[PDB]
Amino acid sequence: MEQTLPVTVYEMDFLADLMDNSELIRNVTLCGHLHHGKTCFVDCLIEQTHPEIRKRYDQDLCYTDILFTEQERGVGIKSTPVTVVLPDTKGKSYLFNIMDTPGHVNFSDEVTAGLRISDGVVLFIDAAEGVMLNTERLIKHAVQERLAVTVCINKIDRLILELKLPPTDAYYKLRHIVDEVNGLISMYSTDENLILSPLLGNVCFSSSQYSICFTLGSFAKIYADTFGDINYQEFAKRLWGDIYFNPKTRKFTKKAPTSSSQRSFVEFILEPLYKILAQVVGDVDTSLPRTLDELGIHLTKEELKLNIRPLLRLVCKKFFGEFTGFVDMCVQHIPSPKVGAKPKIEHTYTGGVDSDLGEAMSDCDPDGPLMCHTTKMYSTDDGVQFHAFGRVLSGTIHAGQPVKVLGENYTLEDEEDSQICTVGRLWISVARYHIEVNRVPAGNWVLIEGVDQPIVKTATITEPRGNEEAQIFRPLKFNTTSVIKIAVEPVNPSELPKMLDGLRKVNKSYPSLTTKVEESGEHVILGTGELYLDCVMHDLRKMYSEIDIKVADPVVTFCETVVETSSLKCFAETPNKKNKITMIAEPLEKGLAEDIENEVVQITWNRKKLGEFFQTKYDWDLLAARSIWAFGPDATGPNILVDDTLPSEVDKALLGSVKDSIVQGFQWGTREGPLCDELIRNVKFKILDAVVAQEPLHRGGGQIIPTARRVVYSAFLMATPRLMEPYYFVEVQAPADCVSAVYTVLARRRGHVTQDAPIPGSPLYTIKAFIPAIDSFGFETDLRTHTQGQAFSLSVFHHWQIVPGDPLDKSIVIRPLEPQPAPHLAREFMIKTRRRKGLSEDVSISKFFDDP
Amino acid sequence: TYQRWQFTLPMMSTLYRLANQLLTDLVDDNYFYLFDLKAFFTSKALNMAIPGGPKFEPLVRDINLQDEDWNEFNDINKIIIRQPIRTEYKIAFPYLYNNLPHHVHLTWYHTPNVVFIKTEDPDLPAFYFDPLINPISHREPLPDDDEEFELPEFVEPFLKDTPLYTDNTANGIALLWAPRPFNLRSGRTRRALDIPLVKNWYREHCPAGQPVKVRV
Amino acid sequence: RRSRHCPYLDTINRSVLDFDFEKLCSISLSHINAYACLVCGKYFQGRGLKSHAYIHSVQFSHHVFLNLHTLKFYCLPDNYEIIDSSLEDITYVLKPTFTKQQIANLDKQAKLSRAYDGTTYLPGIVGLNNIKANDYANAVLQALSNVPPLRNYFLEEDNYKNIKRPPGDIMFLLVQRFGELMRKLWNPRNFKAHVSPHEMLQAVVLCSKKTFQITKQGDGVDFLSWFLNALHSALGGTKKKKKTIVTDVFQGSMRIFTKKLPHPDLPAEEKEQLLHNDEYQETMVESTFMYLTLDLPTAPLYKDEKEQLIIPQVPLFNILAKFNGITEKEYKTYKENFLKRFQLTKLPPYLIFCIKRFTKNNFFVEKNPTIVNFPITNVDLREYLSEEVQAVHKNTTYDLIANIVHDGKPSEGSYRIHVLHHGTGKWYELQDLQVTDILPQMITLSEAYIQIWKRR
RNA sequence: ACUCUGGUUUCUCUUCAGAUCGCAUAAAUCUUUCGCACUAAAGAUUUCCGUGGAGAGGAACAACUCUGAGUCCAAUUUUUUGAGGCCUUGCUUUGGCAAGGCUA
């Protein structure tokens, strides 16, 4: 369209023309650890492609991170999409869709939203800190989402201006980082095809603070420009990997001559960089002009009067020029939407590639059926309306076009979760401005307008009166689990509706947020941490609902389990006094629930392979390995339902008629649970006996589902019940001295330190610990305050561990406001939660039985 | 007029050395966690005092906690207590641990730890593996050596003639992380009144062993 | 086959079916696929196997559900549609588009319509719940209801649904909900004899930017002015439609004769010399009035020596004298004087009088206790129109149909309304949920605040 | 590689300046708030301490550093030739044009 837009190097018509060609588009997610330079890198790219936008001499301008809370905190909170046109090394301009994701672990869900609509991942790793917790988590999540992976080793200047390492030691640090990343990838990925090494161009070395971005190819091209006769590709092949250079023969050999010469990387790449940086920071007034002339860089008198940091940025911008190394890395290794469509459909689309529409989407053809898929919901500045952001997988979305939007519950058999909406407008989403466009072809990111009403988290945009076999994309599988639970109410109940509206809005803004209302009319928000919930509540108070809101103290969501089999075979009949079901409950084997959660086993598999797996990995009986019905409450739920009814006593055909009802009851019971209405975890349910009424009208429906839930509850209760606390994994980056002090903090919060290894090449240590989530509130603040701010920690959900106490212990006396001792913490955690949910004071073991 | 000044880096290094007694040699604002201006504003707006921080009269009228009439929301029979929710927790996350966050400024979160290794021995090389740095434990689709790759005689490292470090390189690298009056090399002259020589002294935490009057 | 024979229909109880509030799931806060449970009246989400409504059905044993958007009944545990005409009334309560009932005066239906409980009521004559202090809003809404043209316009959803709106526009929430409110008020068959204005008042609060709250009561005149202006603006789709239903019904044309005046502290010679300045003469500032602001004479202070009560009494024609044409009421802004003569030029079909009671004196606000002596069956305004204007309007005989009256002190005041129920001739006084049969003679005795007259 | 503006220093006047006008920090007045106001907070105004930007004027010595403007390639893959000649068909603007098969 035609509208006012900021001055840019390219032209908007060229940008629109690049969108049509799906071979020149790169969907890239810039992920990494907290404060590793992703946002500054995007800012450098924006400065390169926008002449009028310049970074302040003192404040690191951030084109992304546009939110007020992001600006004040300094921590990226929401993913920012940026569509630019970047020149390659050869000069060929490519269209780049970059989803700048937050680095904080609490907002890892955000990165997941940026991984569904991207084909490639660029992981930013600090050259000083190295591989951290979020880098490992994001590597696992990316290689598990079937995405191409490249690495940008950011902040190499820290190796020069902070650590002051010798160039060979800097090379050793970079090589160690690359090796550790390769080891992580090989550990999380069976295939060894995606080896990452700067020789292959998979790795780029960057300093977004000083705009020093280069790969081996780009810097070899710099050599080619200064000396024409050299071919840059072969030189870049020879630049890395302990290959020494002989200037007597002008040849590169694996054998080191003179026993004192440095590697090719150190001699040709690292040492010139050290010389440039040292000349700028140390010998500016006395010896900067000579080195500037030797490099061909000419600076004005007013430019040479700048401070050292701006002068470094200017000199390195003039030397390295555009970030062409990044473009090479993301062009040669990150598939285009044309190339990368097939893995995306095979992984995310529910119908699979084998379906006709899957084959249609495998081509990513602009002139096909519309199959846009939006995973983000961006609120306007006023906060009233939301724009659904996502990539177009097939067809072409047009402004002012009728559209069928499919929700997360839309299925072919049940199409009720679908709505016909009229698209209002379409924007190409740059960070601080949006380019309104009439249409968006397949393979591009778009901010659809007017489709926000029927969607909360995930959408499937398609065209109406067509695609009658179209299915939805799989909902976002999240890296972590939302645990921290907070109750929210209004200060003035008269303005309750506003808060409710606000809840809806936050439910749209945060992909992993879960807002519900319990039995006691208490509004519940689930988050991944205290910073995440702080940002959520700031949004809920200022952006969406401008009302004053009271927030309860934070509590965690516990799980329920059993530790030994049921004392007696529990049973329940239907209200019809027929259809008797007799079940027992037993704990699962070690790691079986982990196997189920991590998709190692799926109920979608055939009977043969599932039975073989359960017979070989966990040594189950063939009958026991073939009688498994369902996995827990949801798909791949931690619980297991089996029927041990021998065919002699129970007709299998008759039982199969009520199999759906019994499975529904099992799933509902495991989702709710009888202790404190919490998820039942790691419990094996065996159907010992099942009487079934022959007539269809006396079974099924509301008769067998509540009966199944009742018998599940009885089997769970008679078996010794226990509660699972959520245990977070904590990584502390602390100085060497502070390590001891860290232990002290974890002494007061039931924290177990697993390892305290140092950071190779860095003066700090990474103390890893396993702290209870319920005890983690303020632990970050306690650690930073006790150590004068020198120690920083990031906590992420790790596992579920049984609470020491016994929940069903009526002998325990609990004062209303006292931190209870460990031996009965579970007793405190069960009743109080039972009061928060609104259930009875206590639960009896025979409450759901039939005798009483 | 004596209004603008520009200095060469050796002069600024000597000045930074001569003023080392008046500077805490901090290289981060992480020392000022929950103890900076924004944290103090958050504390004042919430009518709460940081231990090391000052105390103010309430910004708004505060209602006694004994006035609330035991709603289901603030029922203590439902609240699970593990650790006392300190004032620091509420200042760090004002919108999570406060029921009425008004005029509260979000405190700056963690900044990356500056790991600048300060050089003590001038005789040592500027780019030297200091013992503070943890030694790195050592241990590739390389091209074959027999191939015919040749480098032209015109080609050499970009700054091969340039020495890696100079006598005044460590001084400049130190000046990178100096306090604000010394981070610069050009600036504007200030009034003698306008320069607080001891402002950073009380902006930092009070020393651990001090009498009651100096802490106040 | 399961349809037309669902056994769980007797489980439905209409005593708990309150459809006057927001249609969101009680568990998930989701407007999408909101299903009302007909056994307990709670709204849940979805209809499939793993929806909140299905879980509630299998948990609380409530096996009957109605789609709040599709108006179709379902039995969820078996998940089959319910087809029975005996349930139709429930749908009519949920979507009571009372086009015909609101076609005339909302109260036009004086029939002793029976609610589900044994509470006979006249459609349109329906009390509004008093959510904290919102009696002024209830009185104003009842005054705007029982107006045949506006009520008829809002009784049909199609009359305003298809008009365009700006994307980020919230004013239209005032329109549709208001229409919804009308269809709830004029419902011939309703489960209860009262209607909750909660949704309409929430829309009013949201649209007015925290003005005219539900907790704190506001002025009836100010709220009526804002509501009429907002209805006129919101019904103009993406542009200022010069002729909306609000303008067609209530707006008239009046001719302001503004005569500037010299400063009184001047010599008489200069005072008459300023008469030739061509600035202190009558001007043509003819505009459109949505309502007439009648200013009562000040309280007589000392009681008259006669046996009459201390309460002053003034005829309707005496306050309706500023608009005769020759009467010159002084208007004095800061350091300037005027003489605003008023002359009506177009009489709207429904005339609105906004009698000025509350005036801010030097220290507090005083409510004028003057009693307006007005007839309730015949008022001729032919003498207040220009001769060239009198010929245009064949009819000028106005009948009072609505009378908003404020009682009590200016701070802790209460609002009630006298509405004329058409079809019958009865006059009903509504105050929140209280509906009394007032005698026609007693209406003139109370302190009239706002009045709505019909031109016939 | 050759020409021509824009110079720097200082004094003064005018105007704008929400820019941390200031990497510093005072005073007064009014209102508000609970105490009962140096030992107290909020809101607002104003005055002082003194800056930045632009323009104008004065006088001191520098006049082209900078900012700029005006101003060595014949042997594959482009610019030191596979280059020219024969025949047939449609129109002949009876010069030849368009296509194909050739010889080189």
mmCIF file with all atom_site columns, C-alpha atoms in Angstrom, chain C residues 185-286:
data_model
loop_
_atom_site.group_PDB
_atom_site.id
_atom_site.type_symbol
_atom_site.label_atom_id
_atom_site.label_alt_id
_atom_site.label_comp_id
_atom_site.label_asym_id
_atom_site.label_entity_id
_atom_site.label_seq_id
_atom_site.pdbx_PDB_ins_code
_atom_site.Cartn_x
_atom_site.Cartn_y
_atom_site.Cartn_z
_atom_site.occupancy
_atom_site.B_iso_or_equiv
_atom_site.pdbx_formal_charge
_atom_site.auth_seq_id
_atom_site.auth_comp_id
_atom_site.auth_asym_id
_atom_site.auth_atom_id
_atom_site.pdbx_PDB_model_num
ATOM 1   C CA . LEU C 1 185 ? -37.822 -4.665  29.285 1.00 0.00 ? 185 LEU C CA 1
ATOM 2   C CA . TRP C 1 186 ? -40.617 -5.176  26.742 1.00 0.00 ? 186 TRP C CA 1
ATOM 3   C CA . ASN C 1 187 ? -40.510 -8.972  26.799 1.00 0.00 ? 187 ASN C CA 1
ATOM 4   C CA . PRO C 1 188 ? -44.148 -10.162 26.925 1.00 0.00 ? 188 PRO C CA 1
ATOM 5   C CA . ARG C 1 189 ? -43.050 -13.470 28.495 1.00 0.00 ? 189 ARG C CA 1
ATOM 6   C CA . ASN C 1 190 ? -40.240 -13.063 31.025 1.00 0.00 ? 190 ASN C CA 1
ATOM 7   C CA . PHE C 1 191 ? -39.067 -15.300 33.849 1.00 0.00 ? 191 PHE C CA 1
ATOM 8   C CA . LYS C 1 192 ? -39.042 -12.387 36.313 1.00 0.00 ? 192 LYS C CA 1
ATOM 9   C CA . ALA C 1 193 ? -40.845 -9.059  36.578 1.00 0.00 ? 193 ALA C CA 1
ATOM 10  C CA . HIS C 1 194 ? -37.568 -7.109  36.768 1.00 0.00 ? 194 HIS C CA 1
ATOM 11  C CA . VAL C 1 195 ? -34.485 -6.527  34.622 1.00 0.00 ? 195 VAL C CA 1
ATOM 12  C CA . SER C 1 196 ? -30.883 -6.078  35.748 1.00 0.00 ? 196 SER C CA 1
ATOM 13  C CA . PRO C 1 197 ? -29.261 -3.043  34.074 1.00 0.00 ? 197 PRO C CA 1
ATOM 14  C CA . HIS C 1 198 ? -25.794 -4.285  35.018 1.00 0.00 ? 198 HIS C CA 1
ATOM 15  C CA . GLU C 1 199 ? -24.528 -4.833  31.470 1.00 0.00 ? 199 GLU C CA 1
ATOM 16  C CA . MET C 1 200 ? -25.885 -1.498  30.242 1.00 0.00 ? 200 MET C CA 1
ATOM 17  C CA . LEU C 1 201 ? -24.388 0.356   33.204 1.00 0.00 ? 201 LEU C CA 1
ATOM 18  C CA . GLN C 1 202 ? -21.025 -1.357  32.707 1.00 0.00 ? 202 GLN C CA 1
ATOM 19  C CA . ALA C 1 203 ? -21.109 -0.222  29.080 1.00 0.00 ? 203 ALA C CA 1
ATOM 20  C CA . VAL C 1 204 ? -22.015 3.294   30.242 1.00 0.00 ? 204 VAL C CA 1
ATOM 21  C CA . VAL C 1 205 ? -19.110 3.381   32.703 1.00 0.00 ? 205 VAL C CA 1
ATOM 22  C CA . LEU C 1 206 ? -16.634 2.046   30.139 1.00 0.00 ? 206 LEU C CA 1
ATOM 23  C CA . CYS C 1 207 ? -17.779 4.452   27.419 1.00 0.00 ? 207 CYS C CA 1
ATOM 24  C CA . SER C 1 208 ? -17.878 7.530   29.677 1.00 0.00 ? 208 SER C CA 1
ATOM 25  C CA . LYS C 1 209 ? -14.288 7.062   30.947 1.00 0.00 ? 209 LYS C CA 1
ATOM 26  C CA . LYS C 1 210 ? -15.120 6.518   34.638 1.00 0.00 ? 210 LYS C CA 1
ATOM 27  C CA . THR C 1 211 ? -17.914 9.122   34.550 1.00 0.00 ? 211 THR C CA 1
ATOM 28  C CA . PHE C 1 212 ? -21.443 8.159   35.631 1.00 0.00 ? 212 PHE C CA 1
ATOM 29  C CA . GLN C 1 213 ? -20.299 5.240   37.760 1.00 0.00 ? 213 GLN C CA 1
ATOM 30  C CA . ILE C 1 214 ? -22.559 2.520   39.118 1.00 0.00 ? 214 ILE C CA 1
ATOM 31  C CA . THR C 1 215 ? -21.370 2.957   42.715 1.00 0.00 ? 215 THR C CA 1
ATOM 32  C CA . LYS C 1 216 ? -21.711 6.759   42.818 1.00 0.00 ? 216 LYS C CA 1
ATOM 33  C CA . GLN C 1 217 ? -24.949 8.214   41.471 1.00 0.00 ? 217 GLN C CA 1
ATOM 34  C CA . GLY C 1 218 ? -24.810 11.126  39.041 1.00 0.00 ? 218 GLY C CA 1
ATOM 35  C CA . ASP C 1 219 ? -27.105 13.855  37.798 1.00 0.00 ? 219 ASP C CA 1
ATOM 36  C CA . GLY C 1 220 ? -30.072 12.658  35.781 1.00 0.00 ? 220 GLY C CA 1
ATOM 37  C CA . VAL C 1 221 ? -29.921 15.609  33.386 1.00 0.00 ? 221 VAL C CA 1
ATOM 38  C CA . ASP C 1 222 ? -26.189 15.233  32.733 1.00 0.00 ? 222 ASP C CA 1
ATOM 39  C CA . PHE C 1 223 ? -26.464 11.472  32.245 1.00 0.00 ? 223 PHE C CA 1
ATOM 40  C CA . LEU C 1 224 ? -29.422 11.891  29.892 1.00 0.00 ? 224 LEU C CA 1
ATOM 41  C CA . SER C 1 225 ? -27.531 14.485  27.845 1.00 0.00 ? 225 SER C CA 1
ATOM 42  C CA . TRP C 1 226 ? -24.424 12.311  27.611 1.00 0.00 ? 226 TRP C CA 1
ATOM 43  C CA . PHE C 1 227 ? -26.443 9.199   26.778 1.00 0.00 ? 227 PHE C CA 1
ATOM 44  C CA . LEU C 1 228 ? -28.438 10.889  24.019 1.00 0.00 ? 228 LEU C CA 1
ATOM 45  C CA . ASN C 1 229 ? -25.289 12.419  22.527 1.00 0.00 ? 229 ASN C CA 1
ATOM 46  C CA . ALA C 1 230 ? -23.458 9.082   22.679 1.00 0.00 ? 230 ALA C CA 1
ATOM 47  C CA . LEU C 1 231 ? -26.376 7.239   21.076 1.00 0.00 ? 231 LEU C CA 1
ATOM 48  C CA . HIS C 1 232 ? -26.510 9.852   18.314 1.00 0.00 ? 232 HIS C CA 1
ATOM 49  C CA . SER C 1 233 ? -22.752 9.646   17.715 1.00 0.00 ? 233 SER C CA 1
ATOM 50  C CA . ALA C 1 234 ? -22.519 5.849   17.845 1.00 0.00 ? 234 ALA C CA 1
ATOM 51  C CA . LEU C 1 235 ? -25.473 5.340   15.496 1.00 0.00 ? 235 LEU C CA 1
ATOM 52  C CA . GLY C 1 236 ? -23.659 7.409   12.874 1.00 0.00 ? 236 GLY C CA 1
ATOM 53  C CA . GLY C 1 237 ? -21.592 4.739   11.158 1.00 0.00 ? 237 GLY C CA 1
ATOM 54  C CA . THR C 1 238 ? -17.978 5.846   10.573 1.00 0.00 ? 238 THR C CA 1
ATOM 55  C CA . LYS C 1 239 ? -19.350 9.352   9.899  1.00 0.00 ? 239 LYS C CA 1
ATOM 56  C CA . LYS C 1 240 ? -21.737 11.932  11.340 1.00 0.00 ? 240 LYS C CA 1
ATOM 57  C CA . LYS C 1 241 ? -25.100 10.744  10.058 1.00 0.00 ? 241 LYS C CA 1
ATOM 58  C CA . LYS C 1 242 ? -27.099 13.965  10.197 1.00 0.00 ? 242 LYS C CA 1
ATOM 59  C CA . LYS C 1 243 ? -30.378 12.084  10.811 1.00 0.00 ? 243 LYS C CA 1
ATOM 60  C CA . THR C 1 244 ? -30.297 9.311   13.413 1.00 0.00 ? 244 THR C CA 1
ATOM 61  C CA . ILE C 1 245 ? -33.211 7.873   15.376 1.00 0.00 ? 245 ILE C CA 1
ATOM 62  C CA . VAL C 1 246 ? -32.161 9.970   18.380 1.00 0.00 ? 246 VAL C CA 1
ATOM 63  C CA . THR C 1 247 ? -32.250 13.135  16.276 1.00 0.00 ? 247 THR C CA 1
ATOM 64  C CA . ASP C 1 248 ? -35.440 12.052  14.500 1.00 0.00 ? 248 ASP C CA 1
ATOM 65  C CA . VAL C 1 249 ? -37.230 11.520  17.828 1.00 0.00 ? 249 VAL C CA 1
ATOM 66  C CA . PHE C 1 250 ? -35.899 14.008  20.371 1.00 0.00 ? 250 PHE C CA 1
ATOM 67  C CA . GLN C 1 251 ? -33.955 16.703  18.506 1.00 0.00 ? 251 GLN C CA 1
ATOM 68  C CA . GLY C 1 252 ? -35.638 19.936  17.464 1.00 0.00 ? 252 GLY C CA 1
ATOM 69  C CA . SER C 1 253 ? -34.542 23.244  15.979 1.00 0.00 ? 253 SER C CA 1
ATOM 70  C CA . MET C 1 254 ? -34.477 26.422  18.070 1.00 0.00 ? 254 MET C CA 1
ATOM 71  C CA . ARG C 1 255 ? -33.553 29.976  17.078 1.00 0.00 ? 255 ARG C CA 1
ATOM 72  C CA . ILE C 1 256 ? -31.175 31.725  19.475 1.00 0.00 ? 256 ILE C CA 1
ATOM 73  C CA . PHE C 1 257 ? -31.434 35.524  19.342 1.00 0.00 ? 257 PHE C CA 1
ATOM 74  C CA . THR C 1 258 ? -28.196 36.517  21.072 1.00 0.00 ? 258 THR C CA 1
ATOM 75  C CA . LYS C 1 259 ? -28.130 40.255  21.807 1.00 0.00 ? 259 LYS C CA 1
ATOM 76  C CA . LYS C 1 260 ? -24.814 41.482  23.175 1.00 0.00 ? 260 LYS C CA 1
ATOM 77  C CA . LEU C 1 261 ? -24.994 44.206  25.796 1.00 0.00 ? 261 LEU C CA 1
ATOM 78  C CA . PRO C 1 262 ? -22.739 47.128  26.732 1.00 0.00 ? 262 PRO C CA 1
ATOM 79  C CA . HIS C 1 263 ? -21.085 47.106  30.125 1.00 0.00 ? 263 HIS C CA 1
ATOM 80  C CA . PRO C 1 264 ? -23.582 48.518  32.661 1.00 0.00 ? 264 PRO C CA 1
ATOM 81  C CA . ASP C 1 265 ? -20.908 50.782  34.199 1.00 0.00 ? 265 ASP C CA 1
ATOM 82  C CA . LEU C 1 266 ? -20.936 53.186  31.239 1.00 0.00 ? 266 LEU C CA 1
ATOM 83  C CA . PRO C 1 267 ? -22.580 56.563  30.603 1.00 0.00 ? 267 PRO C CA 1
ATOM 84  C CA . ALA C 1 268 ? -25.975 56.507  28.929 1.00 0.00 ? 268 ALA C CA 1
ATOM 85  C CA . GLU C 1 269 ? -24.630 58.418  25.920 1.00 0.00 ? 269 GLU C CA 1
ATOM 86  C CA . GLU C 1 270 ? -21.936 55.800  25.339 1.00 0.00 ? 270 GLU C CA 1
ATOM 87  C CA . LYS C 1 271 ? -24.498 53.074  26.071 1.00 0.00 ? 271 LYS C CA 1
ATOM 88  C CA . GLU C 1 272 ? -26.714 54.294  23.225 1.00 0.00 ? 272 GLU C CA 1
ATOM 89  C CA . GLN C 1 273 ? -23.686 54.975  21.007 1.00 0.00 ? 273 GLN C CA 1
ATOM 90  C CA . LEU C 1 274 ? -22.716 51.306  21.332 1.00 0.00 ? 274 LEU C CA 1
ATOM 91  C CA . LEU C 1 275 ? -26.147 50.475  19.881 1.00 0.00 ? 275 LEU C CA 1
ATOM 92  C CA . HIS C 1 276 ? -24.749 51.603  16.508 1.00 0.00 ? 276 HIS C CA 1
ATOM 93  C CA . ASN C 1 277 ? -21.710 49.299  16.813 1.00 0.00 ? 277 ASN C CA 1
ATOM 94  C CA . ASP C 1 278 ? -23.653 46.489  15.044 1.00 0.00 ? 278 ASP C CA 1
ATOM 95  C CA . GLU C 1 279 ? -22.143 44.112  17.636 1.00 0.00 ? 279 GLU C CA 1
ATOM 96  C CA . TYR C 1 280 ? -24.676 44.484  20.475 1.00 0.00 ? 280 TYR C CA 1
ATOM 97  C CA . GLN C 1 281 ? -27.720 43.497  18.381 1.00 0.00 ? 281 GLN C CA 1
ATOM 98  C CA . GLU C 1 282 ? -29.652 40.298  17.760 1.00 0.00 ? 282 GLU C CA 1
ATOM 99  C CA . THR C 1 283 ? -27.729 37.568  15.942 1.00 0.00 ? 283 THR C CA 1
ATOM 100 C CA . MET C 1 284 ? -28.691 34.402  14.067 1.00 0.00 ? 284 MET C CA 1
ATOM 101 C CA . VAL C 1 285 ? -27.220 31.518  16.068 1.00 0.00 ? 285 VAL C CA 1
ATOM 102 C CA . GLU C 1 286 ? -30.109 29.153  15.338 1.00 0.00 ? 286 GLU C CA 1
#
